[PDB]
Amino acid sequence: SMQEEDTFRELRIFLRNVTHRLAIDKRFRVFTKPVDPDEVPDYRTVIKEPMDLSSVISKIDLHKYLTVKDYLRDIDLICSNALEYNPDRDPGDRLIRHRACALRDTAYAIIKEELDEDFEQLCEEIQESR
Ligand SMILES: C[C@H]1CN[C@](C)(C(=O)NC2CC2)CN1C(=O)NCC1CC1
């Protein structure tokens, strides 16, 4: 229905605004664009599903996310990729991991304060009906 397409358009506006607020934060610079294979050639031998904030905006615009849960699966993948690729004790790995955990925790905290729980339940019930 037209009502349903209006629901999904509001979801996209909300996701673009959360993603923009993450992308301008200086702590999250190394998560804003895909890893360059001609700077880190080993990356794609270890990490089987790369993800970054520029790819997330592209996915919003392609109508890939029908719920906030499917968006948070990609924010979780950005954070889990960094914990797996940079697991060592040295300061450079520990700084990347601390920033990855902060990106994940910031996304969840914005959504807890700003997403209405009945708006998410509506999106889940439309998705299940298709
Ligand atoms: C995920 C981040 C952090 N971990 C990596 C291994 C790294 O340390 N890369 C060193 C800088 C070449 C890979 N990576 C990037 O390449 N980000 C590129 C920024 C977005 C433009």
Curated annotation (Swiss-Prot):
<protein>
    <recommendedName>
        <fullName>ATPase family AAA domain-containing protein 2</fullName>
    </recommendedName>
</protein>
<feature type="coiled-coil region">
    <location>
        <begin position="108"/>
        <end position="130"/>
    </location>
</feature>
<comment type="similarity">
    <text>Belongs to the AAA ATPase family.</text>
</comment>
<comment type="function">
    <text>May be a transcriptional coactivator of the nuclear receptor ESR1 required to induce the expression of a subset of estradiol target genes, such as CCND1, MYC and E2F1. May play a role in the recruitment or occupancy of CREBBP at some ESR1 target gene promoters. May be required for histone hyperacetylation. Involved in the estrogen-induced cell proliferation and cell cycle progression of breast cancer cells.</text>
</comment>
<comment type="subunit">
    <text>Interacts with ESR1 and NCOA3 and these interactions are enhanced by estradiol. Interacts with acetylated lysine residues on histone H1.4, H2A, H2B and H3 (in vitro).</text>
</comment>
<feature type="domain" description="Bromo">
    <location>
        <begin position="3"/>
        <end position="114"/>
    </location>
</feature>
